Amino acid sequence: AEYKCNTNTAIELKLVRFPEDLENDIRTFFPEYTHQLFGDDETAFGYKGLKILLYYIAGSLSTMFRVEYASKVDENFDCVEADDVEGKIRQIIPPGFCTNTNDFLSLLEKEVDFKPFGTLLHTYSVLSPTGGENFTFQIYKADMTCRGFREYHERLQTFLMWFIETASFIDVDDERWHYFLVFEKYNKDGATLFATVGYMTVYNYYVYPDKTRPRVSQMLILTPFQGQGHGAQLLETVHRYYTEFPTVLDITAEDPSKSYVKLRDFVLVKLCQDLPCFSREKLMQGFNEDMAIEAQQKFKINKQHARRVYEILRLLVTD
Amino acid sequence: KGGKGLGKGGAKRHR
Numbered sequence: 001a002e003y004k005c006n007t008n009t010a011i012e013l014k015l016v017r018f019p020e021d022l023e024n025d026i027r028t029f030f031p032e033y034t035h036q037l038f039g040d041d042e043t044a045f046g047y048k049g050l051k052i053l054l055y056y057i058a059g060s061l062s063t064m065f066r067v068e069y070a071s072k073v074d075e076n077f078d079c080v081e082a083d084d085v086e087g088k089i090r091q092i093i094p095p096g097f098c099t100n101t102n103d104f105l106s107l108l109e110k111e112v113d114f115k116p117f118g119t120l121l122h123t124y125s126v127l128s129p130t131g132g133e134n135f136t137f138q139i140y141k142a143d144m145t146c147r148g149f150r151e152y153h154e155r156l157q158t159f160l161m162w163f164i165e166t167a168s169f170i171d172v173d174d175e176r177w178h179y180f181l182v183f184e185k186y187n188k189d190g191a192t193l194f195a196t197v198g199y200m201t202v203y204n205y206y207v208y209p210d211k212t213r214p215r216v217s218q219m220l221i222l223t224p225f226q227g228q229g230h231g232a233q234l235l236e237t238v239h240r241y242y243t244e245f246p247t248v249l250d251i252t253a254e255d256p257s258k259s260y261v262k263l264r265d266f267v268l269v270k271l272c273q274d275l276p277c278f279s280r281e282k283l284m285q286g287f288n289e290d291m292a293i294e295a296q297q298k299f300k301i302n303k304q305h306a307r308r309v310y311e312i313l314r315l316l317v318t319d
Numbered sequence: 320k321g322g323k324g325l326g327k328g329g330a331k332r333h334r
């Protein structure tokens with residue numbers, strides 16, 4: 001019974017910039033979902049003191065994968081075999097990971113060579129109000145023409161399984177996939193390096209005869225960076241990106257979560273708040289179609305979402 | 320795993 005383990009707490013994830021991050025428990029985070037590998041019960045059988053280590057170098061996401069345990073069942077005395085935990089994980093990470101912290105640390109030495117993929121879209125800083133540290137972030141649009149992107153995306157996509165309930169891996173040969181990446185800049189040994197923060201995949205969905213309606217598919221801000229404004233920056237940058245294309249109608253999402261809906265409401269209200277069609281005097285007259293029209297034309301906001309924007313803003317202007 | 324253009328084609332969790 002001590003040989004059944006919850007895989008949501010057994011799987012230990014780290015993003016590593018400095019050798020000491022390996023021994024800092026603050027750096028470790030845990031899946032929200034493991035049911036797609038370990039079933040509805042999210043349990044692995046056969047091991048006491050199970051640790052599934054998935055450690056990633058912060059930028060490149062070069063991977064160390066190790067399964068550790070205190071003891072395990074012996075089919076000779078227990079008459080049952082332990083679960084193939086190692087095989088399950090290898091189903092969703094690419095080959096070539098290292099298997100010990102020595103080798104992982106040697107890869108960390110050259111992490112300065114890691115550079116962000118694609119075209120720079122936006123840079124922003126979180127400036128200290130109090131004379132402390134400032135932090136600097138950048139958003140890129142990347143694709144499979146970028147050297148090393150294909151392999152990096154394979155390392156990255158594993159994180160969707162832990163954090164998006166119904167995540168599936170996309171067909172990267174499909175040319176309608178767009179990729180948006182968020183990086184934090186940081187210094188180490190007098191150099192400047194890039195840490196992966198999160199990303200979004202967007203499907204450039206065809207609307208006959210000659211338009212598209214970009215569909216937000218998979219969006220993830222990695223645990224350590226959540227609730228700090230990055231998700232909002234990312235969705236805003238994405239809207240701003242597609243706003244330059246007349247052939248884009250507006251932007252939607254694939255089966256959005258409650259938390260995504262909340263995020264989207266936040267971003268879209270911010271974008272629309274000072275538009276002429278959403279003035280207080282207009283809001284007080286009730287929803288008008290030209291609010292959807294203006295939101296679509298200015299920011300590629302879908303009509304359904306423009307209506308929510310109206311509701312939220314009407315509530316804001318009243319008591 | 321999902322059909323064409325889908326990234327959320329996996330299983331829901333049923334505790």
Ligand SMILES: CC(=O)SCCNC(=O)CCNC(=O)[C@H](O)C(C)(C)COP(=O)(O)OP(=O)(O)OC[C@H]1O[C@@H](n2cnc3c(N)ncnc32)[C@H](O)[C@@H]1OP(=O)(O)O
Nearest residue numbers: 219220221227228229230231232256257259260262263266
């Ligand atoms: C639906 C899809 O396309 S995929 C599913 C979305 N992804 C996931 O659920 C994966 C796990 N979660 C995440 O990756 C992230 O937490 C995201 C993308 C949901 C949100 O990104 P974050 O960087 O954490 O959000 P950010 O800090 O920019 O939030 C901006 C504002 O949006 C709203 N908001 C964002 N997340 C939430 C939430 N979970 N609940 C309620 N409101 C939220 C809030 O108003 C927030 O402001 P606040 O922090 O002052 O309350």
Ligand SMILES: [Cl-]
Nearest residue numbers: 252253254256
């Ligand atoms: Cl939607």
